[PDB]
Each structure stands twice: as structure tokens, then as C-alpha cells.
Nucleic acid binder design. Structure first.
Lengths: 94, 96
DNA sequence: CGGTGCAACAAATTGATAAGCAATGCTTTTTTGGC
DNA sequence: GGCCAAAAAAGCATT
DNA sequence: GCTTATCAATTTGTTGCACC
């Protein structure tokens, strides 16, 4: 399911909400999530999960193709942690 | 932290949606993603990231406090792989 | 609208095994804006 | 909505 | 290749948000 597919599926079930509105909303919701993380603030949706930021210390990495060293700045990376409902619904195995 | 309430309010302010619809929409967006996932389907949101399913075989674990060796049972878990676009936007963030 | 209670959240333990990534050009998919 | 060419984003190599 | 994450069980402090 891609972004667009997600939009189509929502529109379909929500006949009373205009398709254009659904599209705009999904896009807006995602951009909102994105900018939130970009601002260094976390996201916490009970039953779905939370998105936090993890720190990566500066280090001397390598260009995997050539082997040359590369000086990497310290930085932040997004990390998602699936919530209880999502974990349970996803887990097909006991 | 960003919440459904904050998300609804935002949809309201920006798109002029009724608070009723904004609420329902946020809820649905997340639900749809869950539906796909519980159904074994991968979710690829361009400009954000991918929610992938990985099947993990049983592996050795333990009760941290005590030390009692306990197995981590086999399970299907959901992981998120942030895309390059999202990653760049976030790389220079500063925890609020 | 706003107060409230509580499941779901976060954090903290240890240690064996799993997953993810530094660069970057080429290929493939997805989004975009016009009809 | 469909279709299309162009651009953006991602997928891959290996990441 | 080397770094970071996954997870066990359990206790304790915090909060999203459904329900009034």
C-alpha cells in the first residue's frame, strides 16, 4: 500500500468525505508528522506506535564501494516503535 | 509529543475541516495502515518511510533483572525504515 | 468544551542474535500537473 | 477517475 | 565490517485519549 493507495482506500470507505479532502488530509497529516520530527519533537499515537529521535555519534565511516574513509557528523535518525494493538494485530504467530 | 488531538486540530486549522471529520480522518489514516500491516502487506509512504513486516525465529533471551535464560518466542514484527527524504529533514534536529 | 481515570506508554536491568549503514551512479517506481 | 511525460523519490548494488 | 536494535520479565513513573 503506497501513499496514493492509502488515500484511495480511505476515500472509498468514507463516501461522505470528498475524495479531494481525503487526499489533502493524508498529505497534511504526513507532512505534519514529518515536520514534527524535523523539529526534534516525538510522535505518540496510542495503539499505533511512537516515533522518536535517536542520536548517532560522529564517526569515521567508509564509502562501501571504494573503501575510502569519510568523516561523518553526529546526527539524529527517526525511530519507530510499534504500539501494543499494532504489534498484536500484526503478529500472526503465537 | 504530537497526538491525534494535535493532528485533528491541525487539519481543522489548515484545511477548514469540521472537527468531527478531522477527528475521524486521523483515526482512519492510522487504522488503514494497521489494516494493511495485519494483512501482511508492506506500507510505503513516499517522503516518509516504509513499514515492513519481518518474521523473527525464536532466539535466546533472558529475564533482565534476575538472569533467568528465557526464550524470545518466534513472532512477526512491524519495523519502520525511514526514507532518505525524511532522514535529511531530521538529521540536524535537536531534541526539544 | 473540559475533567478524569487508566491502559498504554517510557525507562531501566544483560547478553546472543538480528538488522541497518557510511557513498553514489544507474535503474525502477511513484508522484505531479496538464488534458 | 484515466492517461501521459516529466520530475521526484526510492530501490539497488552492498545498504 | 562495524554499529545499532531487538527482546526476554518486572517494577515504577508518565500520558494519550476515550469516556463521560
Amino acid at each position: 500500500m503506497t501513499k496514493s493507495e492509502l488515500i484511495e482506500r480511505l476515500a472509498t470507505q468514507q463516501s461522505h468525505i470528498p475524495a479531494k479532502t481525503v487526499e489533502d488530509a493524508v498529505k497534511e497529516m504526513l507532512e505534519h508528522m514529518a515536520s514534527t520530527l524535523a523539529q526534534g519533537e516525538r510522535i505518540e499515537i496510542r495503539g499505533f506506535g511512537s516515533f522518536s529521535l535517536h542520536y548517532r555519534a560522529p564517526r569515521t565511516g567508509r564509502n562501501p564501494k571504494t573503501g575510502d574513509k569519510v568523516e561523518l557528523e553526529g546526527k539524529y535518525v527517526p525511530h519507530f516503535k510499534p504500539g501494543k494493538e499494532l504489534r498484536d494485530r500484526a503478529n500472526i504467530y503465537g | 509529543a504530537l497526538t491525534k488531538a494535535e493532528m485533528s486540530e491541525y487539519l481543522f486549522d489548515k484545511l477548514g475541516l469540521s472537527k468531527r471529520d478531522a477527528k475521524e480522518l486521523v483515526e482512519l489514516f492510522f487504522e488503514e495502515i494497521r489494516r494493511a500491516l495485519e494483512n501482511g502487506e508492506q506500507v510505503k509512504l513516499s517522503g516518509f518511510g516504509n513499514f515492513d513486516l519481518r518474521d523473527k525465529n525464536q532466539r535466546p533471551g533472558r529475564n533482565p533483572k534476575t538472569g533467568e535464560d528465557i526464550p524470545i518466542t518466534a513472532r512477526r514484527v512491524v519495523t519502520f525504515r525511514p526514507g532518505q527524504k525524511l532522514k535529511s529533514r531530521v538529521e540536524n534536529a535537536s531534541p526539544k
